[PDB]
RNA sequence: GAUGGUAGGAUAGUGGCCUACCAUGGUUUCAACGGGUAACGGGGAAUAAGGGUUCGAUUCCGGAGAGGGAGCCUGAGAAACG
RNA sequence: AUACAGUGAAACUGCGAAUGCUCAUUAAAUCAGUUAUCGUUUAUUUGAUAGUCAUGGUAUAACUGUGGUAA
């Protein structure tokens, strides 16, 4: 799963590839505009706060 | 009519025989077994609500005509040490094969057999409640 | 500049396509795209009959071009309009792209290429070569074929240059982290030792640095260069016409292995034993499903009435129904009828339906759990189909122990229906992938004769030196991998790459002591252990799942190791060499090349808080760890199709840190199991449940704890929960006049609060009586199910029931 | 155009140059005498 | 709605154009109406034939279509059919 | 030229893009002529024509960068 995460004050947009099932299934069942933490996904994302903005499907 | 129903290449079909008391329902079910293993695809699953006369229901193999010989405990297929006169080998035996040489039974409380079944032969399903 | 070409290139391609074999080329260089289609045209002009299609596999990019014909035509038209070309110009490469037949395929979509046959395949991305992928494509390339790898990377360029300049030395830069493609290095070296491979550059200046540097052109001008399988094709064949209704289908049958396997099935048809399976172990694609089609053809032409098909999943029933020879009726369609026209696939859990059925075929038995296997090996007739030498399933020894716990003759299919036997690429592939598992059958140790555990030794392996392609190290590697495959039940081909290149993974060998003469002969292992360091030391598995199941920031900060594999043999399973190795490894933790074999002493481990083993739950290994020293930690709920068993993890800690949060987890997990009975493993064996609960009892009644013990319940809370009329009816059924439903209303929470240690100490009933209580109140199953579980055909069940509830009544 | 150039190759004698870069078979089954031919065909 | 009235909607605008409310009409042997018309027809429409016997050259044909019925959209002007 | 003024691609905006071939035949229909519009519409042309904050807020495109998909 690839994630484009941007931080707009620095203009820093970086993509990440994730290889599991669990962290992405944690992000499952959401709509755009909501919020999900970073502790349920990343040991290096503790205290991070990420807002959905969009996406692209597999096709 | 029922062999026409068998020759119908459908998956689902219901063949029903509502008979009065004393007309040879066991003869009809055994004839259904012989027909739909002789020309049917694979084999049939037989369900009764009780340990009924499935032994004679398979014994109607080539006999069961004008003289049927339904006997309590003297009958020759009911006797364990027997030669059922229609034995099987690498022979053309099919209509004399789809019967007492392959006595098999299904308890009606194990309904997964008849939930994934292909052809079944049912003695006395009127007593069976509607969802089952 | 019409330059010459070295004889090696067209010589190899012609010789391959007249020997029905496959060749392989690797191109280093700046382009390789322009040098590809010369090869393709060359291969057709070597032979005009062979297949045309070329498969192109890539990870995510395409080298300087794109596939969509509208896009390419629009670009090139607009290039004419912008005036950069001539109207009728197309280079050789783009000609090849828009003229040939290509199937493009990703890496991750590697499973849509199974049944097809391709004339050529192209592998674009070299630094992502999954073994499973490479097995896919190489197996599916048809004979008289080319496999070509493109190698645009200066990284691999420097790698191969360094390896050629020095086989022993290598080139490893830590700009990647701690991940290095040792599997790819082994790939490159074994390819160097291939007998019909070639390394070549752009403009085809063949490099003599590796490969079959000196092939000679055969004189293929002959009709007798013909294999013995061709030579003893059917020559006494009863192909005559007065009557030949199955002789037609035997003539349709292709190889001699197919032919006499069909002879095996017809001999089985003649054979009238009842409890019987006809076993085919096959290589993959070698005529297994073709034999299935001829088997169903013969067994509806002459067999009983028809057959039930059983498969763990809908695999290529595509080809199983595509075997044809017009819809079925009583007309001359018989030899075409005994095929597709009875589409009724069933689920292999209908074993009683199967017991009734005339004949049943089972396909890929390796994905069927053993109880289902026996329930289909009832007293009737079955055709067993399985793949030996094979991914995604069983092994040779696993299938033999299967038939031995079972039970009759077996037949093995080998001759490839596509390409020529004794194939160099096929053999080299089997060697590199290491699936030639016959090391169990070798005459030195075909028997179980092994020494005693009084002296056995652990050895840590310098896996870099192991995977360095040096023939004795290589030899040791197939020995240990044969052990590995025999040890597991089912295996994946990428796992070899996994422990070769995964940084945190380690391997150990329990070995007999060194031969005191010189130590020149080969060491021969007794057991092999695969672990991986996991935790805050960093492996995505254990602290994640613990954190999910319970919030434990302490556990997130913790670091330990997970055991993935215990590696012994059923020949050595007599006594417990693994237990020896377990005790040894736990003692080690808590107490011009680098060498091929490193002693355990000269490598200090890190600080390991905990050790945890992850495994599919079974009675034998559960009993084994339970006799060993691991805490039952977690059991899943949904048994997958493949293993048929819920996954389960053990832990163990014994250091100066007295943990006891493991004991807290043990109490929680026993409580959780008490909850989860009659939910998902509603139907599994009570003695297994008993083993699990007493192992948990051991774990939470381990040492070093005093507040983890249970406190006695209160009669106040007793009367809080119960009702005096329920107590009255308890005494009434104690007087034995009421109904067991009227006691089963209140049985389960009696079991619940009983199975606390307060009642465990108050009244001790840990026998078959407790088994019956567990079954009836917490497994919540029928008294009849308990009766046939205990195999006691009378009311002994109610005898022990009356005894134990009587004991409860005098408690009350 | 096999003998001529195409793509960028032309094939010599060997050295490819590249650029810069039942009654039917019963009757006709001839090891049978006609006597048993008609005998079998009658049966 | 055939003829007309009265009222209203609609339209840029009158007007049965359309609806209510009504009156019961209109055309006609001066042949209405209807039929055929080869109606590629005719128009001094068109420059003419600066002397061919009537003939040339131009212009209007008239409408519809832009896979096929149906519906919508802008612009001063489209029922645009790229 | 330390605001720019030369030149200029991408784009905003204004206007035009309502001056193409094939198929079907009507005698107050069409067409030609002649009205009327104290009964209508008009971008454009030209002609007139309005006493009733030393300056308010926005946004984009483009650009930058990160990506998806065979497209």
From Swiss-Prot, chain A:
Coiled-coil segments: none
Domain of life the protein comes from: Eukaryota
Cell location: Cytoplasm; Nucleus, Nucleolus
Annotated S-S bridges: none
Subunit structure: Component of the small ribosomal subunit (SSU). Mature yeast ribosomes consist of a small (40S) and a large (60S) subunit. The 40S small subunit contains 1 molecule of ribosomal RNA (18S rRNA) and 33 different proteins (encoded by 57 genes). The large 60S subunit contains 3 rRNA molecules (25S, 5.8S and 5S rRNA) and 46 different proteins (encoded by 81 genes). Interacts with snoRNA U3. uS11 interacts with MPP10. Component of the ribosomal small subunit (SSU) processome composed of at least 40 protein subunits and snoRNA U3.
Family named by the database record: Belongs to the eukaryotic ribosomal protein eS6 family.
Job description of the protein: Component of the ribosome, a large ribonucleoprotein complex responsible for the synthesis of proteins in the cell. The small ribosomal subunit (SSU) binds messenger RNAs (mRNAs) and translates the encoded message by selecting cognate aminoacyl-transfer RNA (tRNA) molecules. The large subunit (LSU) contains the ribosomal catalytic site termed the peptidyl transferase center (PTC), which catalyzes the formation of peptide bonds, thereby polymerizing the amino acids delivered by tRNAs into a polypeptide chain.
Note: Present with 66000 molecules/cell in log phase SD medium.
Name of the featured protein: Small ribosomal subunit protein eS6A
Gene: RPS6A
Curated annotation (Swiss-Prot), chain B:
Reported phenotype of the disruption mutant: Leads to a strong inhibition of 18S rRNA synthesis. Deletion results in an altered alkali-soluble beta-glucan phenotype. Heterozygous mutants show haploinsufficiency in K1 killer toxin resistance.
Binding-site positions, ATP: 22-31
Residues spanning the membrane: none
Locations listed in the record: Nucleus, Nucleolus
Recorded family membership: Belongs to the RNA cytidine acetyltransferase family. NAT10 subfamily.
Function: RNA cytidine acetyltransferase with specificity toward both 18S rRNA and tRNAs. Catalyzes the formation of N(4)-acetylcytidine (ac4C) at positions 1280 and 1773 in 18S rRNA. Required for early nucleolar cleavages of precursor rRNA at sites A0, A1 and A2 during 18S rRNA synthesis. Catalyzes the formation of ac4C at position 12 in serine and leucine tRNAs. Requires the tRNA-binding adapter protein TAN1 for full tRNA acetyltransferase activity but not for 18S rRNA acetylation.
Subunit structure: Interacts with TAN1. Associates with 90S pre-ribosomal particles.
Protein's name in the database: RNA cytidine acetyltransferase
Organism of origin: Saccharomyces cerevisiae (strain ATCC 204508 / S288c)
Parent-protein start and end of this portion: 265 to 396 of 1056
From Swiss-Prot, chain D:
Source organism, top-level taxon: Eukaryota
Subcellular location: Cytoplasm; Nucleus, Nucleolus
Signal peptide annotation: none
Similarity section: Belongs to the TRAFAC class translation factor GTPase superfamily. Bms1-like GTPase family. BMS1 subfamily.
Binding partners and assembly: Interacts directly with RCL1 and the U3 snoRNA to form a stable subcomplex. Component of the 90S small subunit processome also known as 90S pre-ribosome that consists of the 35S pre-rRNA, early-associating ribosomal proteins most of which are part of the small ribosomal subunit, the U3 snoRNA and associated proteins.
Function (record text): GTPase required for synthesis of 40S ribosomal subunits and for processing the 35S pre-rRNA at sites A0, A1, and A2. Controls access of pre-ribosomal RNA intermediates to RCL1 during ribosome biogenesis by binding of RCL1 in a GTP-dependent manner and, via its affinity to U3 snoRNA, delivering it to pre-ribosomes. GTP-binding and/or GTP hydrolysis may induce conformational rearrangements within the BMS1-RCL1 complex allowing the interaction of RCL1 with its RNA substrate. Required for RCL1 import into the nucleus.
Protein name as catalogued: Ribosome biogenesis protein BMS1
Residues of the full protein shown: 356 to 569 of 1183
